[PDB]
Amino acid sequence: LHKEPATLIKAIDGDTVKLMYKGQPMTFRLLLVDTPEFNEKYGPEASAFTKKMVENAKKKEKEFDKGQRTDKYGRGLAYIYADGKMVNEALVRQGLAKVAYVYKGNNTHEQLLRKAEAQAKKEKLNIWS
């Protein structure tokens, strides 16, 4: 896979961000993770984490996987990076997202994220507390 520039319009919540992609405003859904909804426990916290990680990065990037690049709702599907740190991974590592929605052919970082999730579980962080 490779990274490409992401043009942030705005944070949305723990696992969705609004990007300008080829001049179209699109919701992007983070691959391989599930954050709580905003008003569920850990929701505000996941939102805030994703929001600050992406907003504060000088270098914002996205990375499509090998399979589908949009979902059935027209949302983009990508891994998002903030100064070369993957947001998807960091959410999972901090126990603010579960590994989720793992579909074959769009699952390149699956093992990386499962490693992160096991350590968040070991540490009893957030979702796993």
Ligand SMILES: Cc1cn([C@H]2C[C@H](OP(=O)(O)O)[C@@H](COP(=O)(O)O)O2)c(=O)[nH]c1=O
């Ligand atoms: C992350 C992801 C979600 N989705 C779909 C599955 C779920 O559809 P159903 O809505 O029909 O249950 C929905 C979950 O999104 P949210 O967790 O953003 O609600 O998005 C994909 O199709 N591909 C993906 O990679």
Ligand SMILES: [Ca+2]
């Ligand atoms: Ca969610």
